[PDB]
Design a binder for this molecule. Structure first.
Ligand code: RA3
Length: 167
């Protein structure tokens, strides 16, 4: 039993809710919240900008030190950093950005990072400003992630479409 509430169950291990991931993280305090990161960990907008704003920019300060030490992430890659006031940990995962011409096949690699964590609160990777089709992202998620993932979908209209079209 865990503390996630109001989710629709899609599969054995994937759950979905119309929710603001920031508000969900603050209420749940999950062990892991996933950020929709870019390779530079520049958290300017979308999910990343919202999450970073909720940390009062502490996420960005920590991220800048990470990049100065380690250099950029790979598209499809990830790193574990602090969850600040939102979660114990933040798993920063880089899905391909269609608006930069990155290969959508890397979306599966991105979701594979979730399998290193038993339970996660996450957005749909490569959705929103990353330009991928969220219906496709959900399909890849269900077909790749084996651990327990709680998906927060900000847009109610999109949430209803994801549920109604789910095979
Ligand atoms: O679909 C859309 O219209 C945009 C969404 C945005 N993003 C989010 N996901 C879940 N929680 C979110 N809280 C936010 C607060 C913000 F200020 C900006 C974005 C989010 C956000 C990912 C999905 C992928 O499908 O796309």
């Amino acid at each position: 039993v865990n503390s996630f509430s109001g989710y629709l169950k899609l599969t054995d291990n994937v759950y979905i809710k119309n929710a603001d991931i920031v508000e969900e993280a603050k209420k749940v305090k999950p062990t892991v919240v996933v950020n929709a990161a870019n390779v530079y960990l520049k958290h300017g907008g979308g999910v990343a900008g919202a999450l970073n704003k909720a940390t009062n920019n502490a996420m960005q300060v920590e991220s800048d030190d990470y990049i100065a030490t380690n250099g950029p992430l790979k598209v499809g890659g990830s790193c574990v950093l602090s969850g600040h006031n939102l979660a114990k940990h933040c798993l920063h995962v880089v899905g391909p950005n269609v608006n930069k011409g990155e290969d959508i096949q890397l979306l599966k690699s991105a979701y594979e990072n979730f399998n290193q964590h038993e339970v996660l609160l996450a957005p749909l990777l490569s959705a929103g400003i990353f330009g991928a089709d969220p219906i496709h992202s959900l399909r890849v998620c269900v077909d790749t992630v084996r651990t327990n993932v709680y998906l927060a979908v900000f847009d109610k209209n999109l949430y209803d479409k994801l549920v109604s079209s789910f095979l």
